Amino acid sequence: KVSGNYNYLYRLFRKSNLKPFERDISTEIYQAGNKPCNGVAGFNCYFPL
């Protein structure tokens, strides 16, 4: 689209590798730091989509 089609998405991070033909869509927040990150994305924890 000239104006920008943004209905298609991918991911930049996942906690673990997946088996083939895997089936689930978990869009939970992913963190990289040792401390837990909950709620909104912050430091060492960002939106995975």
Partner 1 sequence: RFASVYAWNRKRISNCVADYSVLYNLAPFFTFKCYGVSPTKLNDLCFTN
Ligand X SMILES: CC(=O)N[C@@H]1[C@@H](O)[C@H](O)[C@@H](CO)O[C@H]1O
How far apart are CB 46 and ligand X at their closest, in Å? Answer: 13
Q: Which residues is 30 bridged to in the sheet?
A: 46
Binding residues for partner 1 (CB under 8 A): 12-13, 32, 44
- Given the complex with ligand X, which of 1 and 21 has the nearer CB atom? 21
How far apart are CB 11 and ligand X at their closest, in Å? Answer: 5
Find the Cα–Cα–Cα–Cα dihedral 37, 42, 43, 45, rounded to 10°: 50
The residues of the shown chain that bind ligand X, judged by CB under 6 A, are 11, 14, 22-26
